[PDB]
Amino acid sequence: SIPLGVIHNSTLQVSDVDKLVCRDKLSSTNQLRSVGLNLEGNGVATDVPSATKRWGFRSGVPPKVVNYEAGEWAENCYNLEIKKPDGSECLPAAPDGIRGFPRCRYVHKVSGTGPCAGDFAFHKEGAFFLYDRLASTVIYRGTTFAEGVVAFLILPQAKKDFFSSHPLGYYSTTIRYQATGFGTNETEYLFEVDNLTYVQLESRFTPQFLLQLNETIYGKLIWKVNPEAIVNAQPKCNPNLHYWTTQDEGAAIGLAWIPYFGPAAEGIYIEGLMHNQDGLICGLRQLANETTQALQLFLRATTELRTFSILNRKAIDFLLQRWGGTCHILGPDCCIEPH
Amino acid sequence: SIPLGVIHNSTLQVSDVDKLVCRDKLSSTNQLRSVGLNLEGNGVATDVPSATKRWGFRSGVPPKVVNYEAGEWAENCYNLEIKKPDGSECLPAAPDGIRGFPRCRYVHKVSGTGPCAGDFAFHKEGAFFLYDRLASTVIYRGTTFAEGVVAFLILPQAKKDFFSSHPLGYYSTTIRYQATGFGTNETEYLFEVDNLTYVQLESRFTPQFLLQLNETIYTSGKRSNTTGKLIWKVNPEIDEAIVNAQPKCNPNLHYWTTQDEGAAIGLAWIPYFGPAAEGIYIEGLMHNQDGLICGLRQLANETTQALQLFLRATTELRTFSILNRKAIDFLLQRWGGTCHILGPDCCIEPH
Amino acid sequence: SIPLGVIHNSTLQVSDVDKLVCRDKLSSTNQLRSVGLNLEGNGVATDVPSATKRWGFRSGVPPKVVNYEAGEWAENCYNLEIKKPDGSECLPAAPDGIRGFPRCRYVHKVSGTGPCAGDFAFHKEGAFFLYDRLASTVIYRGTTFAEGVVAFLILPQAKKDFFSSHPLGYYSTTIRYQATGFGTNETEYLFEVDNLTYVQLESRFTPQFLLQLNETIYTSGKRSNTTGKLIWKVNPEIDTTEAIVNAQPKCNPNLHYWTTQDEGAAIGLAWIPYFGPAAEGIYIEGLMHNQDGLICGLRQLANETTQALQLFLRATTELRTFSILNRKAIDFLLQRWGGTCHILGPDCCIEPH
Amino acid sequence: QVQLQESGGGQVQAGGSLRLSCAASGSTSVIYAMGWYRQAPGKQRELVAAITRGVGSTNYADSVKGRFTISRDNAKNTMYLQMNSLKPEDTAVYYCNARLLVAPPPYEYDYWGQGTQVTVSS
Amino acid sequence: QVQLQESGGGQVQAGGSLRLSCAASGSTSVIYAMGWYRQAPGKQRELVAAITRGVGSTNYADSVKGRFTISRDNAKNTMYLQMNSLKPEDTAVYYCNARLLVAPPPYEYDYWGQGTQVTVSS
Ligand SMILES: *[C@@H]1O[C@H](CO)[C@@H](O[C@@H]2O[C@H](CO)[C@@H](O[C@@H]3O[C@H](CO[C@H]4O[C@H](CO[C@H]5O[C@H](CO)[C@@H](O)[C@H](O)[C@@H]5O)[C@@H](O)[C@H](O)[C@@H]4O)[C@@H](O)[C@H](O[C@H]4O[C@H](CO)[C@@H](O)[C@H](O)[C@@H]4O)[C@@H]3O)[C@H](O)[C@H]2NC(C)=O)[C@H](O)[C@H]1NC(C)=O
Ligand SMILES: *[C@@H]1O[C@H](CO)[C@@H](O[C@@H]2O[C@H](CO)[C@@H](O[C@@H]3O[C@H](CO[C@H]4O[C@H](CO)[C@@H](O)[C@H](O)[C@@H]4O)[C@@H](O)[C@H](O[C@@H]4O[C@H](CO)[C@@H](O)[C@H](O)[C@@H]4O)[C@@H]3O)[C@H](O)[C@H]2NC(C)=O)[C@H](O)[C@H]1NC(C)=O
Ligand SMILES: *[C@@H]1O[C@H](CO)[C@@H](O[C@@H]2O[C@H](CO)[C@@H](O[C@@H]3O[C@H](CO[C@H]4O[C@H](CO)[C@@H](O)[C@H](O)[C@@H]4O)[C@@H](O)[C@H](O[C@H]4O[C@H](CO)[C@@H](O)[C@H](O)[C@@H]4O)[C@@H]3O)[C@H](O)[C@H]2NC(C)=O)[C@H](O)[C@H]1NC(C)=O
């Protein structure tokens, strides 16, 4: 029951298979794609003190993982190294296939001690943690992530202008904090510039302002400084979408196709920008929000550890429903045109 | 070539794959289900002295698992912790995705020592061990399970009358044993009454009886502190599918299945605020029809041979794509190509 | 974008997926297959000193695995146990599902030390390492493999002639070597007959010669001495005694294949895993030598296909891929009857009566 | 382990009524069938009455059916044989047995009282 | 290892026949080509006969083709040159070599006997 959207003439509308939509032409499987949209573009607070309140510990619920094929540049990303007061670790080790989120402008690194009531860390709002084309519901230790949601789409006749070309350089900065009492409301964060020197955090501080404080300042020392679909539900929607996606299969031509003479794990992606249209992408953001209600329930029922075959099931359902059997020439069930 | 059955008007027909019948209507993948039926509904003995002799040790064969979507309430379940005389383990540790059987009444927990020839424990009859929607072929250490078989099915047009609605409390008690010489024909069992008192076990005893002895001993034995284990002995003196191949088929089916999606809307879709790993199931009873469900019990017995041969051929650790392969084959049979507008092969008909 | 081939009356042509031909009659999923042809039938040198030069070490690229169903008998197979000079390991431990390659004639077991400048061992030419119906891009420690390529294919449905019948057990000997400076251009090999007796190994030595040089030494090689290890050096004055078209230096006309037994073939009470054959009794052998134009057509097609397969593996994030043929079946069926296909039009090639 | 102590025996006229009692302590609960046996001098031991612990079923001999009644109080750990219409042939020593079910490693089973004399005078 | 020894030579009339023998012990597996060489006084060493260990091929000099025969017994570790029709030009010291294939770390190869004189009298 996962809602999916169809794009036609740069307009987005959800697909009602119950009304057996016939306008959409599904010629191949290359038109089916899933995109992961960050939760920051909706207007949420991104600083560490107000982003920690959305993660909580629970025990008794197994974790689940789903994949996505396209993403979006993240302004803020998080990296956690929290441990128990006695020295035991709180967060599980990342499995072999999990890798950090690419294309992060700033990476916030939080380390410290705090109570850890449950086995795993879950999102209080139901969203996902994105790990390099693998969306998960739990936080792993030492791996960079960004909060976001996953949407499913049908592309227009594979025009190759969407997520392959941009109708219309990467430098990552590390920001380090130290936390105490992580996981509860009594928490303290201290910004570390050089080991023996710390600055107390405030809820109104911005990632930029913390950088100039490194130059501003010049036995640990503590300092105090005094400076169809409508997106109408979201407080803000970003009118630009700067995306990345895995390389085109036909793009690589030269000898570099050999894995031995090949690019590393970070030299694969292709970048683009899609700011020309506004109604389309702010319609994408609401569709991604609306589909998370049914996606979480689907993951709970299944026993699969990592799910890779949602789009294949959608293509089978579409093809078992239109040409299901014993349909009529004049019958509207199979949208067939006699002439 | 695993058989699958088609239900029409509460009648089960084992569908012939080459017959390409046009009576069955497929419109989505929600009509394809797999069901796990326990062996105890076929009339087999379920006491641990006799339920153990069906289990053997072999080395040189890798294990395989399958998933099933719906199950059936089990009266008896087992839990093994066998160890070698040296002290080494005999059973492999359970993988991450394996969990105990959801719905059990009595859990027969056995712990002891005995010879362990092979590497894995296999069923001598050919059936499976069911672990919470994951049918395996090997016993895992310290996880509850019930032995049974798996059947593949097509629901009629998905009226929610099957496995979604019940036409018409959970409480499991643990019974603890102690075995020596496990895996051999010279084996001994003792029902562990408590930490220092044991009662000799025989095949005639039923789980209701044992729980009576647990009470009559505790409230009277007075358990004099003679110290050491004392063994008690009950006075020897008094005290189109046909099913008739099976000795007994149960006329009722009391099932559980995963949540029907939808439902929980308040705030329970969030994993952080949602139910635990055991509060997601639904319950039902299908006692109205007897010919249908006994026919189901024979279908799973018939299809277990082809399922085992398919598992040997494959190389997947866990298999989930049997039903999708069936659907793709169905489409390729009938709309494969060049079919006649008036012919048995291609079902499309004028007007 | 992976090419696939279609057989028509024992003539192979790469499927005109771009031309979108519907003469091919696909009826069921039993008609799709993949074959692991190996590189030895292409005429490459297979001796240990020259075969090692095709494998290199790299760090920073994850490994990938692909399933293949049928295969071919291999005359020579390899088994590495390389270790770092300080005692550290170099090759990763084989995962649980990995098993040694079946039907090997000679197994060249190599042991010794050498610098290891990477995390994984890759193929410099771009081919695969085959481990019992699981093609991989890296070398695992202690498992027998054979280097080769895999091709996807659409069969006829007439009588299951291919990989189920004969158009018309086995012994494997292990050869043990000792290597120093593995992975570099200064490597040195020694053929081991026992503890304290080795023979310096050249390129021109064939496995039949090595087994003979074995037998002569045991006969009169004075192994029963306590002097220590000695190195024997062979005298240097004695010899060692679209319709695809093939472009390989040599193509082997015959094909000696093994495949998993048919599900319906077995009838005895051996389907029970307890009373069943072990992991080496599953396979079924055959021999397809009636035609050589088709077989050398297969070898070229798999030589071309690896270009697109390696790029498809790089994009995906799945550890083991089993759903390439299912995607082709879904894709084929969405293109033909995807929507509003006209009776008269040739795209939806149905016939009036 | 269930010491059986009978009571109520003695001399009594023919045609009257008498109540015999048999009590036990120690284990009690494990008891499974309290009963009644009789022995005249020079005769073999014969059945008289039998009752199961749960009052599941009562059994009486043909020579005594319709005249004897066997009952129990449960929460007294006692058992009663209330009997009527005596005849001289009942003059004998009456025993109560307490055949139980589980028993510890001595494995004795079928416990016995020492017997009480009932004398019928006509 | 392959210590060689010639035998059978001596004084003999022209036109007669003689058999020369060359034996070896120690290893005798590793040998690959036993042969026959000759030196007259004041002359260089020239080839006479050659045979491979497996009797793969026999080679004779042109001056000696048709008159000399080279053979072996295999299971005697011996090799014979049975020859006929002597001439005075054959008066020289005859040697057998045992050129083998593998050889131990001294790596000597081309083992050589001490030689035996053959004198042809006419
Ligand atoms: C699909 O099939 C093709 C065709 O069989 C496979 O092709 C092979 O690819 C490898 C890897 O790229 C090539 O390796 C190189 O070989 C060079 C030596 O030459 C070989 O061919 C000579 C013949 O002449 C060749 O060049 C002329 C140029 O005009 C061509 O016209 C002609 O067709 C030939 O291609 C032979 O005489 C010679 O004996 C060789 O066999 C090497 O010099 C070269 O070295 C580079 O790479 C090394 C490895 O990284 C590196 O160490 C060196 O420093 C150097 O950089 C390289 O090894 C093969 O040549 C080629 N085959 C043939 C027969 O040419 C292809 O691999 C296959 N794909 C799969 C996956 O199986
Ligand atoms: C899809 O889009 C919708 C619409 O934007 C979005 O909805 C928002 O997210 C969740 C609902 O899913 C909801 O979260 C709660 O927010 C309150 C915030 O409180 C403030 O709310 C008003 C916002 O305008 C504000 O005006 C008020 O003054 C008020 O202060 C917060 O309190 C909740 O957290 C809880 O706090 C209480 C008190 O301590 C605790 O008792 C409790 O246990 C919680 O911790 C919670 O965060 C939010 O309000 C929604 N916003 C709007 C405008 O409706 C969806 O979340 C989004 N879906 C996804 C998947 O992202
Ligand atoms: C699907 O449904 C069928 C039909 O109900 C099931 O059939 C049973 O299969 C089991 C396992 O093969 C059979 O069990 C056998 O019991 C023998 C003992 O005698 C049987 O038959 C006599 C009368 O003929 C009766 O006493 C009673 O029915 C007994 O069950 C054993 O001798 C058999 O083998 C054992 O002993 C030999 C010799 O020592 C050993 O080699 C064996 O390993 C083993 O120890 C065997 O155990 C049973 O007879 C079948 N019943 C019927 C009615 O045919 C299928 O099992 C079921 N398939 C599933 C669930 O997958």
C60, C137, C311 member nearest A257 (Cβ) = C311
Grouping H, G, I as helix, E, B as strand and the rest as coil, residue B20 is: coil
Q: How close does chain E come to C222, measured CA to CA in Å?
A: 8
Pocket perturbation via mutation, ligand 2, pick of A40, A125, A147 by most ligand atoms within 8 A of CB: A125
The answer to whether residue E122 is domain-embedded is no
Question: Please, what's the b/e burial string for C234-259 (b: 16 or more CB within 10 A of its CB; e: otherwise)?
Answer: beeeeeeeeebebeeeebbeebbbbb
B240 in contact with chain D, both atoms CB, cutoff 8 A: no
E-strand stretches of chain B: 4-8, 11-15, 32-38, 55-58, 65-66, 70-72, 74-80, 104-110, 112-113, 120-123, 128-130, 135-136, 146-154, 173-180, 188-192, 197-200, 230-232, 254-258, 281-285, 318-319
Tell whether A257 is covered by a domain.
no
Q: Is residue C343 part of a domain?
A: no
CB contact under 8 A, C126 and A260: yes
Contact D2, D53 (CB under 8 A): no
Residue closest by Cα to atom 1 of ligand 1:
C303
Documented resolution in Å:
3.4
Q: Which of D59, D102, D110 to mutate to test the interface with B (most CBs of B within 10 A)?
A: D102
In a domain, D83, yes or no: yes
Report how far apart the first and last C-alpha atoms of chain A are (Å, whole number): 34
Which of C84, A36, A325, A39 has its CA nearest to residue B31? A325
Give me the amino acid identity at C64: K
The pair of structure tokens assigned to D19 is 């109540």
| C residues 297-316 closer than 8 Å to A (CB) | 307-308, 310-312, 314-315
The verdict on residue A311 lying in a domain is yes
Of residues A126, A294, A317, nearest to B29 (C-beta): A317
According to DSSP, the β-strands at C128-130 and C134-136 are: antiparallel
- Cβ atoms of A186 and A161 within 8 Å: the answer is no
Residue pair B292/B10 in contact (Cβ under 8 Å)? The answer is yes
Number of domains in chain D: 1
Q: For residue C75, which of C146, C3, C155, C176 has the smallest C-alpha distance?
A: C146
Q: Is residue A335 part of a domain?
A: no
Q: Which atom of ligand 1 is nearest to the CA of C306?
A: 71
Q: Which of B36, B68, B32 is nearest to B297 (CA)?
A: B36
Q: What residues of chain B lie within 8 A of the CB of A136, using their CB?
A: none
Nearest CA among B163, B104, B91, B98 for reference residue B134: B98
Contact call for D102 and B222, based on CB within 8 A: no
Give domain status of residue A338, yes or no: no
Q: Which ligand is nearest to the CA of B303?
A: 3
E9: in domain: yes
User: Phi first, then psi: what are they for C77, rounded to 5°?
Assistant: -135, 160
Residue D62 maps to a domain: yes
Indicate the residue of C27, C271, C326 with minimum beta-carbon distance to B308.
C271
**Are the CB atoms for B74 and B104 separated by under 8 Å?**
yes
Map residue B47 onto helix, strand or coil.
coil
Interface test with A, best of C317, C337, C348 (most A CBs within 10 A): C317
Q: Write the secondary structure of C48-63 as one string of H (helix), E (strand) and C (coil).
A: HHHHHHHEEEECCCCC
Angle, to 10 degrees, between the axis of helix C325-336 and the axis of helix B322-334?
Answer: 40
Q: A297 contacts in B (CB within 8 Å)?
A: 259, 261-262, 264, 269
Burial of D76 (0-12, 13-18, 19+ CB in 10 A): exposed
Interface C–E counts its CB contacts (< 8 A) at 41
CA atoms of A208 and E87, how far apart (whole Å): 112
Angle made by CA atoms A315, A320, A321, in degrees to the nearest 5:
100
**Ligand 2 midpoint to CA A125 (Å):** 8
Handedness of CA C287, C290, C292, C293 (dihedral sign): negative
What is the nearest CA distance from A122 to chain B, expressed in angstroms?
6
Is E30 in Cβ contact with C213 (below 8 Å)? Answer: no
Q: Is A115 in the pocket of ligand 2 (CB under 6 A)?
A: no
Q: Do E101 and C238 touch (CB under 8 A)?
A: yes
Closest alpha carbon within chain A to B69: A302
Containing domain of residue E44, as a range? Answer: 4-117
Give the position, in ligand 3's atom list, of the atom nearest the Cα of C275: 43
Which candidate, C344, C332, C313, places its Cα nearest to that of C17? C332
Q: How many residues does chain B have?
A: 351
Question: What does the alpha-carbon distance between residue B152 and residue B70 come to, in Å, rounded to a whole number?
Answer: 11
Taking the CA of residue C234 and the nearest CA in chain E, the distance in Å comes to: 4
Distance, CA of C93 to CA of D72 (rounded, Å): 75
How many of the other CB atoms lie within 10 Å of CB of C273?
22
- Rounded Cα–Cα distance for residues B149 and B44 (Å): 14
Spacing, Cα A252 to ligand 3 middle (Å): 62
- Residue C209: how many other CB atoms lie within 10 Å: 15
**Does B47 reside within a domain?**
yes
Q: Count of alpha carbons within 13 Å of A34, Cβ hemisphere only?
A: 23
Give yes or no for B234 touching D (CB within 8 A): yes
Q: Do C61 and A315 touch (CB under 8 A)?
A: no
Q: Where are the beta strands (DSSP E) in chain C?
A: 5-8, 11-14, 32-35, 55-58, 65-67, 74-83, 104-113, 120-123, 128-130, 134-136, 146-148, 151-154, 173-180, 188-194, 197-200, 230-232, 258-260, 283-285, 320-321
Locate tokens 């299809």: which residue? Answer: B303
- Cβ within 8 Å, pair B239-D100: no
Per the structure, how many domains does chain A have? 1
Determine whether the shortest distance from the Cβ of A127 to ligand 2 is under 6 A. yes
Specify the amino acid at residue A203: S
Q: Exposure pattern of A224-262 as b/e (b: 16+ CB <10 Å)? A: eeeeebebeebeebbeebebbbbbeeeebeeeebbbbeb
Q: Specify the pairing of strand C151-154 against strand C32-35.
A: antiparallel
Q: Is A210 exposed, middle or buried (0-12, 13-18, 19+ CB in 10 A)?
A: buried
Residues E105 and C196: their CA atoms lie apart, in Å, by 13
* C157 and chain B in contact, CB less than 8 A: no
Q: How far is CA C136 from the centre of its chain?
A: 10
Which whole-number Å values give the CA distances from B80 to A63, B61, B140, B210, in the listed order?
27, 21, 8, 19
Helix axes of C325-336 and A310-322: crossing angle, nearest 10 degrees: 30
d(CA A123, CA A125): 5
Crossing angle of the two packed helices A279-290 and A292-301, in degrees rounded to 10: 40
| CA C323/CA C329 separation, integer angstroms | 10
User: What are the two backbone dihedrals, phi and then psi, of residue C49, each rounded to the nearest 5 degrees?
Assistant: -60, -35
- C310 C-alpha to center of ligand 3: Å? 52
- The region that residue C20 occupies, defined by phi over 0 for left and psi between -120 and 50 for alpha, beta otherwise, is left
Q: Which ligand minimizes its atom distance to the CA of C56?
A: 1
**Are E102 and C217 inside 8 Å of each other by CB?**
yes
Q: In this complex, do C29 and B325 lie within 8 Å of one another by their Cβ atoms?
A: yes
> What stretch of H or E contains B332?
helix B322-334
Sign of CA dihedral A114, A120, A125, A131: positive
Tokens of A315: 């293509």
- Domain contains A150: yes
**Chain E closest-CA separation from residue C30 CA (Å):** 55
d(CA D38, CA A228): 98
Using a CB–CB cutoff of 8 Å, tell me whether A264 touches chain C: yes
Least CB-CB distance to E109: which of C219, C220, C235? C235
CB spacing of B232 vs D102 below 8 angstroms: yes
Is D121 a member of any domain? no
- Reference C299, options C36, C28, C26; nearest CA is C36
Q: Kindly give, in sequence order, each residue whose CB lies less than 8 Å from that of residue B94, ignoring residues fewer than 6 positions away.
A: B131, B140, B141, B142, B143
Q: Do D109 and B230 touch (CB under 8 A)?
A: no
**B41 alpha carbon to ligand 3 midpoint, in Å?**
16
Q: Is B126 in the pocket of ligand 3 (CB under 6 A)?
A: yes
Task: Give the Cα separation of A155 and C275 in Å (integer).
Answer: 53
Atom of ligand 3 nearest to the CA of B39: 60
Bridge-based pairing of strands C230-232 and C258-260 is unpaired
Rounded Cα–Cα distance for residues E35 and E97 (Å): 5
Give yes or no for residue C127 CB within 6 A of ligand 1: yes
Exposure letters A178-201 (e unless 16+ CB within 10 A, then b): bbeebbeeebebbbbbeeebbbeb
Chain B window 43-82: which residues touch C at a Cβ cutoff of 8 Å? Answer: 56, 58, 60-62
By CB atoms closer than 10 A (0-12, 13-18, 19+), residue D73 is: exposed
User: Which whole-number Å values give the CA distances from B189 to B117, B180, B239, in the listed order?
Assistant: 20, 7, 20
Q: How far apart are the C-alpha atoms of B307 and A333, rounded to whole Å?
A: 36
Instruction: Please report residues of B whose CB lies closer than 8 A to that of D102.
Output: 199, 213, 216-217, 232-235
Tally the residues of chain D: 122
Secondary structure (3-state) at A257: helix
Question: Which range marks the domain in which residue A20 is found?
Answer: 5-250+262-322
- The whole-angstrom separation of Cα C274 and Cα B53 is 14
**How many angstroms does the Cα of residue C258 sit away from the middle of ligand 1?**
30
Considering the domain boundaries, does residue B286 fall inside one? Answer: yes
- DSSP string for C18-50: TTT---S----GGGEEEE--BGGGGT---SHHH
Q: What are the two backbone dihedrals, phi and then psi, of residue B219, each rounded to the nearest 5 degrees?
A: -90, 0
